[PDB]
Every structure is written in structure tokens, then in C-alpha cells.
Fold DNA-dependent protein kinase catalytic subunit.
Amino acid sequence: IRIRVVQMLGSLGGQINKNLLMMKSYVAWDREKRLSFAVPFREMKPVIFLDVFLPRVTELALTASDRQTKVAACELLHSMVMFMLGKATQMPEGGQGAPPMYQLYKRTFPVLLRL
Amino acid sequence: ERQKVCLDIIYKMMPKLKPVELRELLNPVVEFVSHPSTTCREQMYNILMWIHDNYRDTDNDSQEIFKLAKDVLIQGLIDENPGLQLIIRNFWSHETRLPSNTLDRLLALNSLYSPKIEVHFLSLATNFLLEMTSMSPDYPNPMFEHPLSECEFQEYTIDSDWRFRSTVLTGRTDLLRLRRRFMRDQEKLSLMYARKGVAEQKREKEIKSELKMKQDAQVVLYRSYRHGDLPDIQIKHSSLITPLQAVAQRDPIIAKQLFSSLFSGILKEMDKFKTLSEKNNITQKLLQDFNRFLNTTFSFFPPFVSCIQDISCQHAALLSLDPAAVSAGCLASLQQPVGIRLLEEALLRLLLPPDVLRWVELAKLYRSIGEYDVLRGIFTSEIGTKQITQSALLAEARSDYSEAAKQYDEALNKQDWVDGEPTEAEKDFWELASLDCYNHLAEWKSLEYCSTASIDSEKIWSEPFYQETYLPYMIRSKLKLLLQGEADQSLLTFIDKAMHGELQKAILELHYSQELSLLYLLQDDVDRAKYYIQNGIQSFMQNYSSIDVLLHQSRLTKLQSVQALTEIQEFISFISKQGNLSSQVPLKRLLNTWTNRYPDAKMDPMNIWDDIITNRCFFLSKIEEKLDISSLIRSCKFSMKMKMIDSARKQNNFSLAMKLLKELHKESKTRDDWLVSWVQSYCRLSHCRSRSQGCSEQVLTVLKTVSLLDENNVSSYLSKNILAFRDQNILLGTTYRIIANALSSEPACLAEIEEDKARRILELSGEDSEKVIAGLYQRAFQHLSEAVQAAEEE
DNA sequence: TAATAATAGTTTTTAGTTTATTGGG
DNA sequence: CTAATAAACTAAAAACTATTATTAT
């Protein structure tokens, strides 16, 4: 299937093929690190941010081949979303009373509903 | 049996041996990797781990044994059998091999590297650093001690099947042993028939079993899910790390940014409690490690190189890599702009300025990405030692590569340097820019000038890193030479000796396999050509999966590459499959159609262009030599070349193939239509040739002999469409307008001052310049009007 | 479903010509 | 007035390994 796709896509025409790609379509998903996570260790424990993971795993589990990858990414994002909502309910931030991942909610609810 | 017993021989007897006999014995042993049987593979792995543990310190030859042992181990870190992967992961992940400290794990994974598994090291390192995080006390504990609210979190089980959606609308057992063999009241050959029939049913059972197994293996989850009306935040850390490592082994890019994040965080946590001397020393150790990593890698996987330069970006102390190495990796792996910032911030932190190396690397990478603004914005500085380079680049900014090549040649041949000798990197810039502009100069002569075996008498021409840059240009030169109908076998002998040497052959298939395919078509090795081309296309689509979505331009270039790949593979997909020597199938009448598919106009620079036409013409030549038809192929290539020259004029690569146009005119007398089309092409090109000196240029050549004296068969004596006729009227009015404007702007031009045939024709078309400009404006208006009434007739 | 029993491939005589070698008449 | 013939010569067949298909299930 994939070799058929690539061969006939090339057969179509390069500038015609260019139509796969204008507000620049990306800047960032947040104005600061509204979400973070500290990975545990036997020794001291550094902190990791899920925000860089959020969008790309969102499309990766949205639509791709290799059903194994789809299921694994979906499980990861469900654990992720449960953790982030728990963190939001844990210690609310400021700016709007509590906009913990408010814009991020605006982004994640559509992908959650379409998946 | 014999291989396994021999490995067990070695395993039992080697603990009583000298190092020298061990080194004698291991060379005819270690190569048994990639054996079809896995069992011998873990047997030799046991041998390797034994000698790995036994050799730690002394004699440098035993140390070499140790080095080769860890090399074969690390290249054994990939196996098709997942059990081998599991057992080697368990072996390496032990504290003895990799100490339990996180920074110890970091330095240990730096200590290990292989050029061939650079695709998978990021995922492997993530797996090593995450699955180890299992003895933390809170690791089994939930992250959040509090639940959301009161709820019943009963477990929700999840099924699994090969079926998918949208498929359906609506000794106590001695009785058995005593009764097992009561054959006596039965017949022998009847039982034999029963046995063989049972064998037959087992055969088709195996058939249906393998038919079922054709689909993917059943997907397994990695986290138990509870059920309730309120979400359960109180869940273990395993619940998130295990899917995380799973997907890390699935996708490389997510592994890339998570590795970057964990690296940055762990350094930002280690720096708080260690002495600055030790942290600094560790930092230089890492810098040496990354320099080694980039120097040793050959198949520059964009994720790995991009992540290592990115993690170097976040730390100021890490802005000290070999900048030429960074430049080469970014250009080769098409991860340029982030490495541009690497060079920029390394310059910024470092603060007489020796930064000319960083300048030249960023400049060549900006030239690679296509733009020119940064080039002049930088070289207008005093740091630009040779303003000849600045003049050359600004003059070729209008795609005038000939003069730029001249500047590069005279600069490299300028022995004297009153302003001081240019650095070696500047000369490397000059020669590589000459190579690129010669690549724009699609003729084979420029390519041969590249292949003139550059100074210091430069597989023989591959090992130095400068030669590594030349190799793509050299082979492109050679293929463009040979494919046009030339034969030297020098390239064939070179690639034959390049088969010898695993690294050189390996890089040439992993990057440049379609070149192998086309030369094997030249040698009619269609099978190996198919092998090379399928390898190339699958590797390239894997790379397209690897590359990120932000850099559109790299994806565009890849798109044109695979476009050319698909035309050549569909050519090889139709040679004599139906049989084509006298069977005039419409396929030949169809492959040339749609202008022989889309030529990808208005963009997609000229190297795509000449590759497309050259392969297409070589193809049709191969068919016609293996098969009125010649008239069809001549018309086809005529159309191809007209689309070429028109698009490249739209490309404004004004250093067109002049003599190609001249020969197009020379045998343009096939029919009137062909030469007419060439005439319009040339005259429109000269119309576009107006520039700053377009005044003197256009008046010196007024469409050569005034539209080449085309007033014999306009629209083939109007027998063609009058759309053609209105086109020549448009062109004639256009050149009249250009000449009249040129004379009005410059009444004192030298050419009109010069007594020449141009003077005669201008006064004929017109005394005083006012009368002449009025007459030519009248003629222009007349011809434009003629085009106008010819326009409305649809 | 997987064994062992026929079983050709080199030396080596030996008959089967052949000969080229005398005196017969 | 026309020869067995000793030697040379090739041919042919047996002897001794000689692994190699070959059934059972």
C-alpha cells in the first residue's frame, strides 16, 4: 500500500504533489511551561515537561499506520491527560483565577473527541 | 549441530588461553552474526559477554581484543529475535556494565557507539534509562495520593482480536496408555491411509494458519485500566513510563524530544550539587564524545544528529563542538537552521575574532537552504577577508553562475594575497560553491571541470572528509557524462572497487542507490537495478517519516527526488512485460502523453529538470534500440526540451543552455511548426533578457535579425491557429516597445551612435530620434492591436 | 514421514586384432 | 613366387570399493 502511494504520488507531478502543504500553521502550544512532571529516581529526581510531547503524540495517535503504535500512543496520552488534569486539580495556577491548561484544554478536547 | 558444538567448544576452552590465541580465534568467529539461527547468536553472545567481563584492564593487544568484543556486542544490540534483544538489554542494563548512577549511565552510553545503529541508539538509550527506573520507592506508588472524589474504580478489561471494525452488518492416566495401541483388530495400510490423510488435513490447517498470520501480530497494551464515572489520578508511575518507553521504541522523533528533555533536566539537576571543576571536566568529556559521534557516523539520520546538536544548544558550555562537523551534519541530514543557531550562539558566547570558521560554515549552510540575504548581510562586514566572494555571490544572486564560477576559479588560482592569505575554510567555500554552481550549469563540461582531480592529486578519492563532500558531485558528474551516450567504464571500475570496503559501499547504497539502478540499466542489470531502486525508495520514505513537518523545503526536495524515482521505476516496470518489438501498444503512445507526465514547472530547480529529461530520453532511446516511431520520440523530446527552456526562463536561470538553443534551431527544420516554436522561445527569452544594461543589450541584438526575419510563414502562413499569430504580434510589439523605451531613455547610446546594420534597421522601422521613436511606437501599437483582434476568436 | 538396500568407478588382466617382419616357389 | 608370427596393439570384462536413491509413517 505505501509503496503504491509513494510511486503514484510521484507519478502525479511534483508541483501538483506540493498541494499537500497560510498563518504559518504553528508557533507553540503554550506561552510558558504550564505543565511539568518530575520523574522519580533512587537518587535525586529531575523534572520533565509534557508540553513538547503533547502535539506530536496527538497526531501520532490520531492517524497513522502500525496499529501497535496507535494503541501504545493512545495509552500514553490517556495516562498523560489523567496526570495533567490531576495536576490541574492539585495546585491551580493564576492569571484567570485558575487557567491551568485552559488553552491546552481548548486544543486537547477536539482531539480527544475526534479520536 | 556442528556450529553449536563448536561455539560450545570455544566457550568451554577459552578461559584457559593466551590473549594472542584469543585474537587469532575471534576473527573467524565474530562474523557469524546475522546467522539464520538465533541460538548460535546468543551462544556467541555468551562468549562475548564472558570475555567482556574477563577483559577490563596493561597489554594494549588484549585491550584491542576488549575493544573489538564491545564493538561486536554493540552491533549485536539489534536482532530480529526479540528474546536476544531482551537478554542483551538485561546484560547491559546491569550495574556492572552500566553503573546505577544516572550520570554514570550517561557517560557509559557515551562510551558506547556504532556508526550503523545510529538510527536506533536514541530509542535504545531511552529504554535503558527508563526501564532502570524501577527500584524507586514511589515508582510503584501513585503520583497523586489524592483521588478526584469518591468512586468505584473497578478494572475495565480490554479485548484483542485479528478482526476489526466494519466487517459485519448483523500415573492415574494408565487407561489411555492401555488403550492407546490396540491395533491388533485393525489393518496396517488402512491405518497408513488414515495417517497420511491426517497429514494432509494438517497441511491445509497450516495453510489457513499462515494465511491468518499474514496480518500483523496482535497488539498488546502496557497498562491496566480501571473503570468509573470519575477519573482516577492515583495511578502508578509505571502506568505512564511503560507506554512512554514503548512508543519511544516505536517512533524516533518522540524519543528525540524526550531524550532532549531528560538530558536537559538531569544536567540542570546535577549542576546544583557538584563542584564546578568536576562538572566542567565532565562537560569536555561529553564534548569529545559528541565530536566522536558525529565524525564516526556515516548514515546521517536527521533525528539523531538534530537531537545531539539540540541538546548541545540548551547548554552554553556545550557550544564548543567542531563547527565544521556540525555544518557537514546539518547539510547532509538537512537539519540546517537549528545548527545555524548552534553556530550563532557558539559565536555569541565565545565573544582578535577567529570566528571566520563559524562564519563560513553558517554561510555555506545558508547557501544550502537557498537564500542569499544572510550571505551578503554577513560578508559586508570587515570579517569578510575576500570581497571577491561577496561580489561573486551578489552577482550570482540573479542565478548568474558562470561569472561566480569565474570568480571562484580566479580566487583559488590567485596565489598572491596582499590583504593576507585566505583561510583554508574560505577556499573550501569557494570550491564547493563552484561545485554547486557547476551543478546548476547542467552541462557535462562543468561536471568534468569538477572531476579534474583537484590539487594535491585529489575509494582512493573517498577517505578524506573533503573528498566525502565531493563524492556526490563526482558521481553525479560521472553519471551525467556517461548517460548522455558516453562510455569510459571508469565509474564502473570505481564502484566495483567501492564494493570492496563495507563503509563506502554501505554509504553509496544507503544514500545513492538510484544511481546504482541507472548504471545497472546502462549495463542492463535490471534485477540489481530493481533491488537498488526499491532499497532507495523504501529508505527515502523512511527518511520522510523521520523528517519533521516544520521544514517544508527539505520535504519538497525529497518530493521531487521520489518523483524522479517513480518515473524511473515505472520505466523499469515496463520493458518487455507484454513484449514490445512490433506490438504497437498504446503504452508508448500513453507514456509520452500528458507531456510525458507533469514536468513540475515554475519551481523545482534545474537539477531535477535535467535529471528528468536525461533519464526520459535515455529510456526512449533504449526502447527504440530494442524495438514513424522515431518521429514520435523526436516530437516527445522536442516538447520536453521546450517545456524545459520555458520553465528555466521562468526560473530566471538566464545562463540558459545557449548552444542547446542554437542546435535546436539548427535541426529545427523538421517541420515548420518546430522551428517556429524555437523562434518564439528564443525571442521571448531575449525579451526577458532585458536588465539594467537591457538598453544596450537589446539594441545590440534586436531579436538578432529582427525577429530572425520570421516574416515568411506567420502561423505557418496562418494555417496554424491565429493564437500563434497573435503571439508573434505580441512579441514584435514587445520588442518594439523595449527598443523605443531604450532609445527614449538613452538617446546617446553607443550602438545607435555606431554605424551598423542596427542603425539601418532602426531607421527603416522609423533623421531625428523623435521620428524614429514615434514610428516604432506606431508599429508596436499596430502589432499589439493585431494580436488583439486575433485574440477574441476563440 | 527419513532407512537401508542396490549400486556405479577405478585397475587389471585378456581376448581380438593388426603388423611388419621373414623365405617361400 | 608368396607365412606363420612376436610383438605390438586396442578392446572388454571382472573386482573392489563406492557412496548414492530407497522404502517406513
Q: What stands out?
A: Chain B touches chain A through 71 residues (CB under 8 Å). Residues 195-196, 199 of chain B lie near DNA strand C (CB under 10 Å from a C1'). The longest helix of chain B spans residues 188-213.
